[PDB]
Amino acid sequence: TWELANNMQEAQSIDEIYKYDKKQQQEILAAKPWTKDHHYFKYCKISALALLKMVMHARSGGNLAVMGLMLGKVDGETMIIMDSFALPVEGTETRVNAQAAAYEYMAAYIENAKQVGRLENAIGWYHSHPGYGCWLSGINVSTQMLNQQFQEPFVAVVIDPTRTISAGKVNLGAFRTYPKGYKPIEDFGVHCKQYYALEVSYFKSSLDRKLLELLWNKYWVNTLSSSSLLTNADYTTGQVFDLSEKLEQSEAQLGDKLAKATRDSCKTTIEAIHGLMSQVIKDKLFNQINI
Amino acid sequence: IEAVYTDIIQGKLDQRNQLLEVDFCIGRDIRKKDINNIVKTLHEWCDGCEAVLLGIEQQVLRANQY
Amino acid sequence: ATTADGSSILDRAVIEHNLLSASKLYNNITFEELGALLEIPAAKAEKIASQMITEGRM
Amino acid sequence: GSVSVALHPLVILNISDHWIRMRSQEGRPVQVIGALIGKQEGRNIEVMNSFELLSHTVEEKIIIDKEYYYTKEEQFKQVFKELEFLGWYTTGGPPDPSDIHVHKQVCEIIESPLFLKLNPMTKHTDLPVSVFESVIDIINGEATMLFAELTYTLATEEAERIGVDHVARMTATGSGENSTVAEHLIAQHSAIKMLHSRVKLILEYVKASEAGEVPFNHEILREAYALCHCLPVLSTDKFKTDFYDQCNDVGLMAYLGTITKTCNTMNQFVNKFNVLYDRQ
Amino acid sequence: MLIKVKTLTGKEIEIDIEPTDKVERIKERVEEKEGIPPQQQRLIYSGKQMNDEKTAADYKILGGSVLHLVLALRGG
Q: Which PANTHER family does this entry report, sorted A to Z (chain D)?
């Protein structure tokens, strides 16, 4: 009653994305929609479990560099990833070569997962960059060339362990690449024309959501003493600046983007009012007792 | 200054406003007749918390309905 | 040995330490009160305070 | 007391993912069996990761096969070096005798295995997981394996908190029609309820001391008085002015953002109007 | 003579090999059918990489066990 909806067994589309429609996957693979246009999938959604597994692998690597695979599927315009799987590769923090150990490891792990009951396939790979941002190098560009031109459904992931640890936010970067021939900012590197970037999103199930909320529930002091909107001021100002640029672009276009601008403005306003609401609730609870 | 050094209260002085601000002071002795008053204050706090809870529920319910 | 200012080495480091410690237990202090507890009559307390700043000490 | 258990916020996610995978695959939720791996440091046991173990069914009983575990044990040794067998987990409620039977061959494989219980059908504030240690009875006859409940901690490395906050900020609230209010106003409601429970416990102790059930401990009451005197926090004018400035700023930020949603609806209305009642 | 090759992405290849054929020869044919580069194929047979020097001599198999091919994938 207090939570109203609660959950005994009911779910929604959030829990629906975890399945394997064999006929649907077969027909999208056979139709091959992305082989006809270069500007295909721009949305990549990766589950939480894969994220933490990648982060732990990168941290266990230390100052050196690690490298592993990933598992998932593709659905329409979007890409779904929900598994991480590390590899036993070694090398200097500036270069790593996959020896025969990884070649015998990926196949063995795939067979073990198939025996377990897993049904997904290889979708890409993740490589850790210890310090030098998140950008594909020349050898990475060539490897992504060959991988996306031989194994069309693919995507690369680059993270920065050191900067993630120091700053406090993750450095997940999902990249697809433009094939050879199609020709039509120093941070991204020197091959900025050959490779581009993609947006990142996350999901979690109903059971995962309940477990995460109940585990994070042992954070009450920080929960009611955080006083947000005083820590994310720079983020909100940057969001408003990007809102202004998007609004200008939409106004120029009118002479759609307006829907995207409206959604972004709604998100920022919702965050601001949520911060104000938490502040008001704290003031009501603490400052209105004993006169 | 010497009282702060003894660490019985924690705070800072301000000569411009002629004020002393205390962030935390140790509780003094309690006789066995004032305890009831203590109860009262705690009771009040509890009531306030309960009130907030009620409001929370109402608000979220309305939101969902909308 | 003195620092050619009439004050020895000991009662200049101790004065700077007193000034630094007073910065944690005060919000704003007048020059007269700062010199009252530092033995400076009125004048060189301000000079010492200004010297202790612009170097990151206080 | 036995061993100190160090649980990590990674095994639980593995169990939940496995459970949802099986529930979606088979439609009717079933029981899942896995493993737990980690480190043994003297009298301390810590869990790092967890991989599923294949389990066969014979008649009505469940049997853990040894060959698959033997093949998979050396496979993950390449990536994780100082990682060793600790125990296994399963989904369920109370410890049934089938748990004892399945734990028999686990004790055969490893002398003293741990046990993890995850209950997806929980309706209590306590942690759904539970850690059990195996004890061999001395009474003659059917020597049942006794489960001794221990305490589980929440030891985490540096990157756990940031990751859980990053994933929990969004939770796909805008796609499932769950309403962002039903997330924000509810997440802190539990914390407020916990604070209410703690204050209620303190008040109950103070009342009991007043009545005479508990001895007159003339040390806790002083702290209770000090806590009582610190309730009206920051009732100065500067705080009120700052709070009012914050409220006005957030109100203006909401005005700029309502004024654009209204404009977008305005644009969609004129676009639909220029086709129905006016040609071209 | 009717061997099957399954990759980790889903591509299925059916190839015909004389039992006494060389390993370079089978790579050359599978590159002809699909388009693999001549020197960048890793071939896995029953969880064991096929040695290039060791020519195939005894294929005591009619289906079932399948060699999975994988590309060299490396970064820096």
A: COP9 SIGNALOSOME COMPLEX SUBUNIT 6, EUKARYOTIC TRANSLATION INITIATION FACTOR 3 SUBUNIT F-RELATED
Resolution (Å units): 3.5
A216 backbone dihedrals φ, ψ, rounded to 5°: -70, -15
Would E14 be classed as within a structural domain? yes
Question: Do the Cβ atoms of B52 and A289 come within 8 Å?
Answer: no
Cα A103 to its chain centre, rounded Å, is 26
Q: Do A105 and A87 form a contact (C-beta atoms < 8 A)?
A: yes
Residue E32 lies in a domain: yes
- Round to whole Å and give the CA distance between A15 and A224: 30
| Interchain proximity D246–A276, CB inside 8 Å | yes
In a domain, E40, yes or no: yes
Would residue E75 count as lying in a domain? no
Which residue numbers of E have CB closer than 8 Å to A's CBs? 8-10, 35, 42, 44, 47-49, 68, 70-76
Task: Tell me whether residues A4 and B41 touch, CB distance under 8 A.
Answer: no
Q: CA D199 → CA B44, C52, C57, D228, distances in Å?
A: 11, 48, 44, 11
State residue C9 phi and psi, 5-degree precision. -65, -40
Please give the residue range of the domain that contains residue E55. Answer: 2-70
Say if A167 is an interface residue toward chain D (CB within 8 Å): no
The residue of chain B with its CA nearest to that of C27 is B14
User: What is the helix (H) or strand (E) element at residue A283, kind and residue range?
Assistant: helix A257-286
Distance CA D224, CA A210 (A): 35
In which residue are the tokens 């496995």 written? Answer: D18
Does B64 contact A5 at a Cβ distance shorter than 8 Å?
Answer: yes
Q: What is the CATH number of the domain that holds E23?
A: 3.10.20.90
Encode burial over D156-195: b for 16+ CB neighbours within 10 A, e otherwise. eeebbebbbebbbeebbbeebebbbbbbbbbbbbbbbbbb
Of B1, B4, B12, the CB nearest to C27: B12
What's the total number of domains in chain E?
1
